[PDB]
Amino acid sequence: MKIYYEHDADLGFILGKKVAVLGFGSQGHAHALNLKDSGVDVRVGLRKGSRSWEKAEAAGLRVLPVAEAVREADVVMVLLPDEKQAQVYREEVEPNLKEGGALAFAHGFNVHFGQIKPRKDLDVWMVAPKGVPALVAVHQDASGSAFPTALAYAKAIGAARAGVIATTFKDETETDLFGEQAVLCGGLTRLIRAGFETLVEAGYPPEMAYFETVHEVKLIVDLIYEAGLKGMRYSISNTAEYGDYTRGDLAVPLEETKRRMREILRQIQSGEFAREWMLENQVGSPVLEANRKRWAAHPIEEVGSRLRAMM
Amino acid sequence: MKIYYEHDADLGFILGKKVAVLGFGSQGHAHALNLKDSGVDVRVGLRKGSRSWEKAEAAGLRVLPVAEAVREADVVMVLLPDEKQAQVYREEVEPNLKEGGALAFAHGFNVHFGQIKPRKDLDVWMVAPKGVPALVAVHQDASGSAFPTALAYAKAIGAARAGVIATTFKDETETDLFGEQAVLCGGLTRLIRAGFETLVEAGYPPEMAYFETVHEVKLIVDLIYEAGLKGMRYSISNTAEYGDYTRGDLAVPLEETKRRMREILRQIQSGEFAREWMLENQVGSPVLEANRKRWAAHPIEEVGSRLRAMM
Numbered sequence A, B: 001m002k003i004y005y006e007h008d009a010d011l012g013f014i015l016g017k018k019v020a021v022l023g024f025g026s027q028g029h030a031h032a033l034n035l036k037d038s039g040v041d042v043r044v045g046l047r048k049g050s051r052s053w054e055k056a057e058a059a060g061l062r063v064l065p066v067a068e069a070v071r072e073a074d075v076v077m078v079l080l081p082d083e084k085q086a087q088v089y090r091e092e093v094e095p096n097l098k099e100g101g102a103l104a105f106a107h108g109f110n111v112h113f114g115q116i117k118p119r120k121d122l123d124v125w126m127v128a129p130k131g132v133p134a135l136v137a138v139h140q141d142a143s144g145s146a147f148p149t150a151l152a153y154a155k156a157i158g159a160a161r162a163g164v165i166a167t168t169f170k171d172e173t174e175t176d177l178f179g180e181q182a183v184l185c186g187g188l189t190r191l192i193r194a195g196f197e198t199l200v201e202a203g204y205p206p207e208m209a210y211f212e213t214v215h216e217v218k219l220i221v222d223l224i225y226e227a228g229l230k231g232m233r234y235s236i237s238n239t240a241e242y243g244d245y246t247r248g249d250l251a252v253p254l255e256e257t258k259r260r261m262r263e264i265l266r267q268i269q270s271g272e273f274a275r276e277w278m279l280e281n282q283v284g285s286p287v288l289e290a291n292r293k294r295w296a297a298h299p300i301e302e303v304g305s306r307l308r309a310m311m
């Protein structure tokens, strides 16, 4: 798989261009500040009187309404939540973006699942940071220089150091949603919760349940992060390693789990997940909100709060 | 549940006593150094010509053979791997420990599962560190002051600050083994591996598979560590939160998972796990070793190594 570094990227493909960063969350913040520091002509498009409007000015960046920022720009980088992007593109980017302009993202969801259908004259590309490596993709190369522009942008925000990996909007979006659903968030919270409940129902103090099923996860994952599974197994006690090897499959059996995870991936790949999430947003996200309240009330949180407090 | 702090512990119950720390891993190191710094009379019992022998002297601690260290001690703190403790106790602690001495641990496994059967004249207790709180337990109080000694020991190594929680050898050992098996190590590695394989078999680049199923786990777990599930859900994108809520149970279903985890706990509570692990050690740990080689060869490691290298 193809990796690019600082020397592979040519800042001449960006330094000559005016960049509009829409949004000023953590991503909008980091993108905009690093562009300026790399000496790119950058403005931030925000709604007047917003909290992030004041915050952007405070950081010393030039700030305009979204429509204005876009009229000024050669390159529009959209750093807004997925569910807000479509409306902003339709009503404010698309009428105001120069012929042959570039439209950029950090997440491929909106373009990959057809929520934003870019004008045919635009370049469309993505730089997705994570020694922070980054992913790059080009969905549409109208100018003929989409790719070197994207690479220049990546260097200019500092992602090139640890390496830029070329992918597609498809691969970035699908694997991102899969990871969240199956492993990182969905799967992990369910494992933790089943373990916590198992211990509490068996008569153990909730505090110790929380230690052994929640608090300690960080120790293990930090080892994996630094040195892979192999390194994690090497650092823990032999008792714990033996336990892992011999009981792990009982907790989480391989073929049944992969079967389920294939169905999660199928709902992603088929467009079904995307449809469901977009429809959910059209009627005020009541499933999101109901689930949020219900998980907030889970006894794991009470115990968690009390323990973090006393530590 | 009952919590103790620095003001609840009285260093007079330890400062008057000679402590032998057997072993000089990370725990033996931290225990011994902090005891000395709190002004406790401490020696480290090690085998002559060992790597940890030289390392202990280098740190400025007084070092003796195990038999000698024990003859000098009022309190013997055993900080060795589970599978080595029994032999050292039988052959070197038990013949040499004063009448009415104290025998201490950081892990309850050996005493809880009968691998060490302490003389009836001994105090037996445990201080188990994790703003590092600690667990304390007393298995045997021959002197009548086991508990305040244990608390003094905990303060003297610095565990009292963030709080000492009173438990039993039983609860500490069983929940520790359960967490390892079901969630922290066994369960988590299986989830990660099923997700990684799902993505690779579906045609995605292994690099991105690794990002979305392994590398990123740290971001999520760091949020949970700092602010619980609730806080983690609050920080991630709404798309990711919605995903978690609606697909997590498919990946890891609640009742089947808890059923399996009850069986893991039953094998712990029944003594079966302890028996298996002890027998395993009696014939050179061939299951441990076979599993270690097989997991080392899993393609997740190759991909992992290459990615960590380039970052």
Ligand SMILES: [Mg+2]
Binding pocket: A138, A139, A168, A169, A170
């Ligand atoms: Mg594509």
Ligand SMILES: [Mg+2]
Binding pocket: B138, B139, B168, B169, B170
């Ligand atoms: Mg007990």
